[PDB]
Design a protein around this nucleic acid. Sequence first.
RNA 1: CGGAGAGGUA
Lengths: 248, 50, 524, 76, 397, 230, 228
Amino acid sequence: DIVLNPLGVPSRMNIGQILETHLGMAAKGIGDKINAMLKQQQEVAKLREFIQRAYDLGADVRQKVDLSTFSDEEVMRLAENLRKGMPIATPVFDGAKEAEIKELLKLGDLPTSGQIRLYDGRTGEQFERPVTVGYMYMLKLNHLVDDKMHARSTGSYSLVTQQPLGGKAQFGGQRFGEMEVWALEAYGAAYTLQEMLTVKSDDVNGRTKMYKNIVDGNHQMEPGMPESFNVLLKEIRSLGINIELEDE
Amino acid sequence: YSYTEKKRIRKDFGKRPQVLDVPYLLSIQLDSFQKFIEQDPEGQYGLEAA
Amino acid sequence: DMIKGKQGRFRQNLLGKRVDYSGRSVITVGPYLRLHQCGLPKKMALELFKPFIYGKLELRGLATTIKAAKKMVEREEAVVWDILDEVIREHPVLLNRAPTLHRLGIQAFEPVLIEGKAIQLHPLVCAAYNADFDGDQMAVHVPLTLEAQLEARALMMSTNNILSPANGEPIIVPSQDVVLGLYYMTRDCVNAKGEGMVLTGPKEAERLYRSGLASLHARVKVRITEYEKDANGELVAKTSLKDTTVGRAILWMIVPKGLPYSIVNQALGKKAISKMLNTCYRILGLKPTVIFADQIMYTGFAYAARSGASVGIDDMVIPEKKHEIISEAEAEVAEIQEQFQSGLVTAGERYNKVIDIWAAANDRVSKAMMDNLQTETVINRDGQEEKQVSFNSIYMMADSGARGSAAQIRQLAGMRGLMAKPDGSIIETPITANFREGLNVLQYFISTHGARKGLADTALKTANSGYLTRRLVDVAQDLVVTEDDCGTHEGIMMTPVIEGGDVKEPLRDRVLGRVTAEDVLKPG
Amino acid sequence: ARVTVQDAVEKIGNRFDLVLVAARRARQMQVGGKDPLVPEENDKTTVIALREIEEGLINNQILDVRERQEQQEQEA
Amino acid sequence: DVHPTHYGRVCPIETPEGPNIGLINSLSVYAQTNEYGFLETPYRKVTDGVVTDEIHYLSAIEEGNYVIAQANSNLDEEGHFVEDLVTCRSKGESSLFSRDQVDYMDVSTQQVVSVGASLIPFLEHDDANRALMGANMQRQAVPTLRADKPLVGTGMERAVAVDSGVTAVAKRGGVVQYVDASRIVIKVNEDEMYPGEAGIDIYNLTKYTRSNQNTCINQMPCVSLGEPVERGDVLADGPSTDLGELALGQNMRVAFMPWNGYNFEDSILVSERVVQEDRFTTIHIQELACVSRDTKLGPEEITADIPNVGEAALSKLDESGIVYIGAEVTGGDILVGKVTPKGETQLTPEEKLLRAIFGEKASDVKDSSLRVPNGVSGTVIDVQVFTRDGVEKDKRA
Amino acid sequence: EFLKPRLVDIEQVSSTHAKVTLEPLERGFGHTLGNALRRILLSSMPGCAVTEVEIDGVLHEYSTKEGVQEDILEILLNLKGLAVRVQGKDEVILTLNKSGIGPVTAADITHDGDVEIVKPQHVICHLTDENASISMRIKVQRGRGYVPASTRIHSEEDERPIGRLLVDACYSPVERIAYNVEAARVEQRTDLDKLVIEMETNGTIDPEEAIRRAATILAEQLEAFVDLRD
Amino acid sequence: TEFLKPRLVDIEQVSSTHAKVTLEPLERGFGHTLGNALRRILLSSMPGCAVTEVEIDGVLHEYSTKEGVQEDILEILLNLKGLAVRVQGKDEVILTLNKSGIGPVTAADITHDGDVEIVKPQHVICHLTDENASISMRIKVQRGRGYVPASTRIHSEEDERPIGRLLVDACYSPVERIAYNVEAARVEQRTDLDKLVIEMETNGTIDPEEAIRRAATILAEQLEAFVD
RNA sequence: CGGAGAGGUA
């Protein structure tokens, strides 16, 4: 079902997931082995010793034993709930050792080393060595790509400036900050800064003219005078500090 | 033992029995607000002290 | 208060100076992409390039007005898909990482349409972006005018930025996955399927491996024709028999025409692939280097898949004498503690002795672990087993330089051992265990201090480094090269820096790339 | 088309005026006034201009002499 | 920075990765506030050698005076440690101490981490940085379409599910009289009756409600008719909970190998069968509020009559002005038909020219209806109407 | 030269498990045939599956109904796994009508002559109300692959009726396939191997018909390479 | 049910050796299935004609140099691997190579019959120097299937040919290089369809497009009688 | 689309 990068383990230092895989593969195996037992509709006592042995596996382990449950109905309910694997409780610093995982793998009639040689279903050939296969518990985080994607070309603009922002019906353009301006400056990226700061961002006359130009079937630009600097100019003048233009 | 526990037993590999069971994990909020809002026979944390 | 800004005057470039024709998405890996390509979602392409679609639809007669174009694009029919193909075929877009620490943090690619909901990034370029596919989120910016497209293709296309602008040497380099595949290919054994037979070139080498009639690992005598750049720029074909491996020849036929075979006639670590790309660049040029990088990525990925290199619990070996070494270390520290209580050594001296003993024990454990991994796999040839590079997964996993290190794996199978406590001092008792066995409660808690300090330090240094690069850009924004020559005979002296008692940087690197100020002479 | 600009960089070492002349060429093939000298593949004017510059068919000399001559024939 | 006394009170591996790490902690599993406000952690008292089951909530200052043995070094016989030299912490530093020189020991081995951190299995096999990150992502897990037990858990799943309020817990034991997807009626036992009669106990089930994060939370009845239940058990499984066990994510078949470089850094390859099972699929409930206000130009009204709109949008709107419960809606359509009394009717000559060509109408009330955000869709599952006293009720209310 | 593999005994491990064997197959052809057939089976088989469910009681997927232990969500989820085969009509509308307490199963559906329910003991829901009635109009049709119920909604701009609930239709009769090539000994020449394909399917398709359809698809695909138009 | 069949198959050839054939569109997953199936057909078991046994008139050892030859016998064995021979008659036929004089003994010096056709104009087979300045060779060229190593044969062969009859590896199949790649292809809204590109390099004994079409004919024969 | 506070992400 899931393919994980094996390269993330030898660096990010989380091999517990690897163990989570192996202890998973055993557990689902215990789930699968009894599942077949369910398909043959075998007699109840057989499931009884199978579950009793499955829970009894381990050394100095506190789980207690059956039959303390009801002979038939509760055993059947437990087996039906255990057909999709068998839950395993692993205390964080008192969990299962390697030997216990290997024993549970063996009871599952699965490779005790925890690796079964897969066949690459893409092309249909086995690899030079077996791969690590098992059942791991994956969490779907609330960082959905649907909620994270966005883009825009034309839409809302502020009433104080012509920067694009507003709501989520059409959110404004992405914030190309001064860090990325320096990134462009390091290149010979000189025009690109001018389009991405003047015509694509602020100059309303520039925005309209460039949109008309692209619609008309060409990619040409008007230089423009960004409104952001006009706002800064006006508010400097607002404090009794003069700004003027040395006209060319 | 719990009846909902009988419907699905989870195998534990723990090796030391839990000497102290896990207490109510939201005890902080309830204890704080009950100390706040309950009656007091003497001046102690709560509306009475204020 | 809104004249003043943090950081910088707000609405000029930050905060924030947003821009139209821009987008953002999570990034996925596309391992089928050529180095000049990126995978961009179809919906993102549709609603980014909308004016282009409108213009093309009105030009081709598919629409009669802008309203018709709006209806056509919102209906998302199959007709507009061909229009989008036309407008995207040559038009490039810039991918951009939000924390931008250098110019390669923004790079231009050719957008390749993909169904899905996330952007596909070239695997080689993520190192340049300092972006790791762990939930990181990229932005796209679309050049509009001709000047912008030409300028992005000439300078900001990833093919044109194969060399770091900070210290030279290339920044796009096979990192972990293609590295593992290549290393798996070029390994050799002492006995396997198809050993000691003679082949003419890589053709039937590929034939013999891929049919399963010969193993990848084989000391095989192959007649190959390698081309060398000699004379005044001419290719000379030297056809000769060399002993190699089948996978090495399969890699060799991938190698672009015109490189020495000695580069691929060895087990390849990350440094080896970097050196092969360097040789291809200074020997052939740009386009051969781009083709070589793309093909080596493809082959490394494919044979990493075919290898089935897998990390497990039996593929990571705890040393057999690790417990003995730990016991010896415990005995020594017990003797030291007994002497300290005996009043024979001071508390500080005892602390230093304990730290020294534990460091020596940790080094011994690491050496034993690496000796176990280096030749764990031994294969008989005629009744006698011979040492070889181990088929053990983690040994390739690290030795290839894919992802990890001697110290990094030293804590998986060995012991992560000594570390710092609050105030930065080293704990007397190290992490006696590792990740392959149970960490004691106190041991994990102690490791938590190091992890917390590292994470807090990363956050604080992120803030401080952002502010520092802000200052540095402020001070040097006006510096641009404007003249070819100034005729200044003054300059600076370059010496190979010998700080302490040994040279720490050779003279060649600092002098490399400079222009002489006076004509230097010979010593004598 | 062409994706690498190495040949154009070799032709125009500055590779900044290269952007200028490539933009000029591409704009007046995109905007009426001339036709490309290298046959088309439904490619945009960008890569067409790149492939021209790699072949040494268009540069600043060719561009400005063509501009001069077309000025004399248009003026009278 | 974490502290030596930071141990066992607040989780050292639970803290945000953002620029507030080490300031926002999470309380340890067993830690509790003292009478004065300090954090105290339980410790089993060690009389001479025997570690008794009695506990003392040692405060941070009181902890330093004594020496605390670890939960490790298991106990044989009544209460004696197996090791003569046991790992202990006197002021925060690990050390070796005699079994007869200890004063307290950890009540459990899980009381040094938070609830989020205690759920990670094989925590003693991950790096503190990486396990901290994983515990951080556990809180960000969205509840999957159908909750399913983890094959490899810790055992805190049940405690977290029960102690959280998302679990319908039987207030009084008895025999389940009536099971429904929305209601659970328990015939209470006779020995748990109040004097006189109180009859049944009713549990109404929270079904598909936006919790706080535009995420669905619903409680799943895990019982059947006639099943004998007792006080304190799970009558209905909450979101991300199955059979009273926490069900943050789902168990999946996994192979660890670099398949063709489509999984390159930590990238993940999903089988089509994952989508076939409709697992890792989520229900997201967005709440959109339309407020009918009283303006100085006139009070706003909620009605189906919206000036100059197509009838297709109003087709899903009732005569009360609120979309049906169950209608499939997309962005741009009308959910609540709000109108606002226009101050004055002024028409620009350009507006007159446009309305002459397109046949637009003129109204003395302006559209202000709550339209679906452009980029979202879905089904209307709950409509809440808030009307204060002095305002006439309408059909929907 | 060549000897064609010939279909031999098709045994039934169960109603859902079947092993089909090709004995006279030359060396080097076993894995090719096995891979090709496995890919075709998991990719291109026709199958019957549910698309629209019309429950009288509820109005949308997220609304519960009285007297059922299962939400309408799990009603759709369980109806997804409805193992059903149709013969004459490409689209059929099954009608489930059941009152009274008890587990409402697949066999309780009113079965027509053109529709066969290969899984009668498949539990649909549990009606726990003594006098409630469950009424479902389940649309089951033929298809291939897996169609999420988010593509037909764009084809008509939202379903006009409200009571119909769309379910992502998985027209995949087979859910597990494996193939094993073993060294067969036979009087025919001296070098042939047997290919055994073990199949776990929902029982709505005959294994022989499944293999025949897969081979037909493979041949129709290879037709282009057999005769190059250019 | 409806199905999709490719439109406007594309081919690009380099001589009669290096052919790149592109098929589009292919139903999801079908492209690589066809590619790998026909690939294995061409690789592991593909009918053809190749050299099987050779004669030794000098030193019967395989690690010494032939008298009058400046190189070892091994390298002439490697040279005879790539010779392009096409048999139109009886399966196993004899070819005699008799050339005296210093220089390159090439493919032109072989006898030309009606049972053996050489479509390989020139190729160095051996080099002669003035020690004896003569070479005499007799080889068996046979029809065969796939690739059969000589090391594989000797293990499975109990009867030994007379001394001097050296067994040589057989490159029976007409294709020496085969490779397949599959990429995304876009038709209508769908972009999960797959472009299928096959690249193949043959020994020149058959047109590569003919090799593909006859391999497809082989597989269609294998799959045909299943269809009723 | 005027501005604060919080969490999470990288």
